[PDB]
């Protein structure tokens, strides 16, 4: 008999003896493959390149058939975390002598700082089979150094992960350096650490405590008269760093790790999926300091009140409950789960005694994004060129909605942009030499829209504020809501007020409401969602309200956002209430959501309507849409600006068409009519001659004689009465 | 409480009362009760007034002084089906009208707390009377708008001043007197 994939454990000694590069193994494993004690053999994770080590027979009286025990030196090379499955194999080739080698420290010093070379020689002779990555730590210190470590940083591949060598004193030119990593050109795996996670400092502290105490100080807790926590539940929106924390916990917690990532346990055969959970938990008890990760727990522990849950899933939930309760004697196993939708987990698993402890991973704020970007950019400091922390703080300020995955994508796209630009100067430029100037991160932001916004497909032609002629008070009041609350948060805080977060734009048809919406989308800088009501309505009961909840949820997933309710009056029910069963629920849901964002959040709601007084008073009160602005017909200057914007590509100067006279003639026009006048003039010019160069006053006369004034005294009176409905 | 599938709304209401049985004394709060009984009883009585049926059944089962009481709110009083206002059900009514001069001044004092109104000479007793007919939230809004007027003038503000309150006042509009002070005076009768 010969197991397929053996389990890693430590060889109990950590004195850095002669064994530091041996692999204690059960006799049958060596013999069945005809390996012998002292012979070299390969160890590696399933499907990866191998790691060379020295085989050695263990104590069959105690040592199980399935266990291969390695050294902290060997495990450093491949980042073998206690409990991963190894695909051991025999080896047939002897590596040469390490002609050139270097040794350093993970903590950044030179080994020339504390200890003489003799103990270094002895230690690296105990290694024997030299290769990069053999960290070893906790030696004696010649000085009173608070800590120490040593690492073989480089040396000079038969499906091997590291390039192995053999020690031969003197011939192997061993130098010494400040280096902490191993040579990247080898691409040995690198362990993650809590120093890479940024922004989540407090969550990290809580999780570190909750994992430190149960595994490594259980006896202490029990004296306080309560049983220890035994389940932790990480949750939050996708892309915030849960799985990263799970892998960092695996690397940093010196405990045996078992994983159930998704439905990796389900089986064809009727009973065997339960056997999988029971086996995992039994093996976690075998090596009592251990952690079991259940990532994407909702995929295997569904709610069962959601009747979509199958029999397999109910049987899995029942077994997992009886196991979690059955972690008897208050041992040292800790079960950490991660889920982006914790409410889909069966409540039986969140009861006290089950996953009672929960850590919420929130969306980064500006400071959190600054921390994440500083950490991510500190990994590339020699190629950075955005070295100013001011520049990184600018990028953090501009990246509204980025969640932590999006920031890493931003850095990746910045690398790509820098390569594109550099390679644009020479087809064979040294691509490794290019460095990431801020301009390239700014260019990358154009492509990397937040992942929370990928369900918002909108064409959105590009329109700037300068295109919206002569609405200056509207522009100022939109600044006040879109930019000032973000650039002046501290002044609001000290004054003790929240900025208004709703505005209603009303006015005659043609005046720039939707144009202001497009301008906000183009130049607000923050995320933009639009609901073209009555787009939300749906046949089935509850679907119309679920649409409002979903759009407000995505606006809440975007962090700073702008929900533009075009024709909001379509959602406000009718006066007579005739068959408005669905509409009433729609308006109540909309009000409940505007009240949900009313507290603690900074979403801004913009609404545009042509019938200002047919929308419910509950939806116009402050807290709901606060500000009302009358987007009225352009005055003389506004029409002059529109005429310039339109006729700029006409040769007006030589043509002699004086735009001021047009502005005088066009009194009463809406902006749409002023634009149509220019379009009609251009059509007249083109129809007169297909090779037009100039549009001249006869064409504008022709266009003018055909354009009506859609605005009437009645409409203007109505919109100037809406401001006075109170009396 | 409303779901696409058949009968899931009824189950939800009965389950809400079931869970409500858990304690006493206890207030059940039906905000915007007018959107629980909007129609299908007075009109459009086709097949889907079950939610009203269930709620109006439950409202009777609760004992008169066992410990549970029920509070509701509405700004559309006549949209509430008369079935709910039958005595024994919900017949008691309290009017929450626009604040009087002294109430508005208390709101102003609270929401202008960190404004140095004393140093700037912003005499609240002028704002409290100028803001007559301002219904609650609008008194609060007038103070947010004053602050924004202050910040836009010179970011890094120390205090807000009367001219900012003038700018705020000139931009706020009130409610409808043929709908407010009416349709509630009538509902009082
Ligand atoms: N501070 C950080 N927060 C989050 N992600 C970070 C951070 N720093 C770097 N990252 C990277 O962002 C990604 C985070 O991993 P994810 O798997 O996206 O975490 P998660 O998406 O929140 O968990 P899921 O969606 O349930 S698998 C990885 O590619 C990390 O390298
Ligand atoms: N300064 C401006 N003021 C008004 N309209 C302008 C201005 N500049 C351009 N336009 C034109 O305005 C048109 C669109 O105006 P909209 O904002 O969509 O009007 P509207 O408010 O949506 O009217 P409704 O929705 O029917 S009540 C486009 O054809 C623009 O070319």
Curated annotation (Swiss-Prot), chain A:
Biological role stated in the UniProt entry: ATP-dependent chaperone which uses the energy provided by ATP hydrolysis to generate mechanical force to disassemble protein complexes. Plays an essential role in the cytoplasmic maturation steps of pre-60S ribosomal particles by promoting the release of shuttling protein RLP24 from the pre-ribosomal particles. This step facilitates the subsequent release of other shuttling proteins such as NOG1 and allows the transition of the pre-ribosomal particles to later maturation forms that bind REI1. Essential for viability.
Q: What is this protein called?
A: ATPase family gene 2 protein
Query: What SUPFAM superfamilies would the database entry show?
Result: P-loop containing nucleoside triphosphate hydrolases
Assembly and partners are described as:
Homohexamer; ATP binding induces oligomerization. Forms a ring-shaped particle of about 12 nm diameter, that displays 6-fold radial symmetry. Associates with cytoplasmic pre-60S ribosomal particles containing ARX1, ALB1, RLP24 and NOG1. Binds to pre-60S ribosomal particles soon after their export from the nucleus and is released before REI1 and LSG1 are incorporated into the particles. Hexameric form interacts with RLP24 (via C-terminal); the interaction recruits AFG2 to pre-60S ribosomal particles and promotes AFG2 ATPase activity and RLP24 release from pre-60S ribosomal particles.
Q: What is the effect of changing residue 511 to T?
A: In drg1-11; severe loss of ATPase activity. Severe loss of oligomerization. Resistant to diazaborine-mediated growth inhibition
Give binding positions for ATP 1.
Answer: 236-243
Q: What is the effect of changing residue 675 to E?
A: In drg1-1; slight loss of ATPase activity. No effect on affinity for ATP or oligomerization. Resistant to diazaborine-mediated growth inhibition
Which Gene Ontology molecular-function terms are recorded?
A: ATP binding; ATP hydrolysis activity
- Reactions the enzyme catalyzes: ATP + H2O = ADP + phosphate + H(+)
Q: Which Gene3D superfamilies match?
A: 1.10.8.60, P-loop containing nucleotide triphosphate hydrolases
């Amino acid at each position: 008999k010969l197991p397929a994939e053996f389990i890693t454990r430590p060889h109990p000694s950590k004195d850095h003896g002669k064994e530091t590069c041996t692999a204690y193994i059960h006799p049958n494993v060596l013999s069945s493959l005809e390996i012998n004690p002292g012979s070299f053999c390969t160890v590696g994770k399933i499907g990866e390149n191998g790691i060379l080590v020295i085989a050695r027979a263990g104590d069959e009286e105690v040592h199980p058939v399935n266990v291969i025990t390695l050294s902290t030196t060997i495990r450093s090379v491949g980042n073998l975390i206690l409990g991963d499955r190894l695909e051991l194999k025999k080896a047939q080739v002897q590596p040469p002598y390490a002609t050139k080698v270097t040794v350093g420290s993970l903590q950044g010093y030179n080994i020339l700082e504390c200890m003489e070379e003799k103990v270094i020689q002895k230690l690296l002779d105990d290694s024997g089979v030299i290769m990069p990555g053999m960290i070893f730590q906790n030696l004696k210190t010649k000085a009173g150094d608070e800590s120490i470590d040593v690492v073989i940083t480089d040396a000079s591949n038969l499906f091997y992960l590291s390039p192995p060598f053999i020690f031969r004193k003197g011939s192997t030119h061993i130098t010494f350096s400040k280096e902490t990593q191993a040579n990247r050109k080898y691409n040995l795996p690198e362990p993650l650490s809590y120093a890479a996670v940024g922004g989540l400092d407090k969550e990290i502290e809580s999780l570190k405590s909750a994992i430190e105490i149960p595994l490594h100080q259980p006896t202490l807790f029990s004296s306080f008269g309560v049983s220890p926590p035994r389940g932790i539940l990480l949750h939050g929106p996708p892309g915030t760093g849960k799985t990263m924390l799970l892998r960092v916990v695996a690397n940093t917690s010196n405990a045996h790790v078992l994983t159930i990532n998704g439905p990796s346990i389900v089986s064809k055969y009727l009973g065997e999926t339960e056997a999988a959970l029971r086996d995992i938990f039994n093996e976690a008890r075998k090596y009592q300091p251990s952690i079991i990760f259940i990532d994407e727990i909702d995929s295997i522990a569904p709610n069962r009140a959601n009747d979509d849950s199958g029999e397999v899933e109910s049987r899995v939930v029942a077994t997992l409950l009886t196991l979690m309760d059955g972690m008897g004697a208050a041992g040292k196993v800790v079960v950490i789960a991660a889920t982006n939708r914790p409410n889909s987990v069966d409540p039986a698993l969140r009861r006290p005694g089950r996953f009672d402890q929960e850590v919420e991973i929130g969306i980064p704020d500006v400071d959190a994004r600054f921390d994440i970007l500083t950490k991510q950019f500190s990994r590339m400091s020699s190629d950075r060129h955005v070295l100013d922390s001011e520049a990184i703080k600018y990028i953090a300020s501009k990246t509204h909605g980025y969640v932590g995955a999006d920031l890493t994508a931003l850095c990746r796209e910045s690398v790509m942009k820098t390569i594109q630009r550099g390679l644009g100067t020479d087809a064979n430029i040294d691509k490794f030499s290019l460095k990431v100037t801020l301009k390239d991160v700014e260019s990358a932001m154009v492509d990397i829209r937040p992942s929370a916004m990928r369900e918002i497909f909108l064409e959105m032609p590009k329109v700037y504020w300068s295109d919206i002629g002569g609405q200056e008070e509207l522009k100022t009041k939109m600044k006040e809501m879109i930019q000032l609350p973000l650039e002046a948060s501290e002044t609001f805080a000290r004054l003790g007020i929240s900025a208004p977060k709703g505005v209603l734009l009303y006015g005659p048809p043609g005046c720039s409401k939707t144009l202001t919406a497009k301008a906000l989308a183009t130049e607000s800088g923050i995320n933009f969602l639009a609901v073209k009501g009555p787009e939300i309505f749906n046949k089935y009961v509850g679907e119309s309200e679920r649409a409002i909840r979903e759009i407000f949820r995505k606006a809440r997933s975007a962090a700073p956002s702008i929900i533009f309710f075009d024709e909001i009056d379509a959602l406000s029910p009718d006066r007579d209430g005739s068959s408005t069963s669905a509409a009433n629920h729609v308006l109540t849901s909309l009000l409940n959501e505007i009240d949900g964002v009313e507290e603690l959040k900074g979403v801004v709601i913009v609404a545009a309507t042509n019938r200002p007084d047919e929308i419910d008073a509950a939806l116009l009160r402050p807290g709901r849409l606060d500000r009302h602005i009358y987007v009225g017909p352009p005055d003389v200057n506004a029409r002059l600006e529109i005429l310039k914007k339109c006729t700029k590509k006409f040769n007006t100067e030589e043509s002699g068409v004086d735009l001021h006279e047009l502005a005088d003639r066009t009194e009463g026009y809406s902006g749409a009519e002023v634009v149509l006048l220019c379009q009609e003039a251009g059509l007249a010019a083109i129809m007169e001659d297909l090779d037009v160069a100039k549009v001249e006053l006869r064409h504008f006369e022709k266009a003018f004689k055909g354009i009506a004034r859609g605005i009437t005294p009645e409409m203007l009176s109505y919109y100037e009465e809406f401001a006075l409905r109170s009396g």
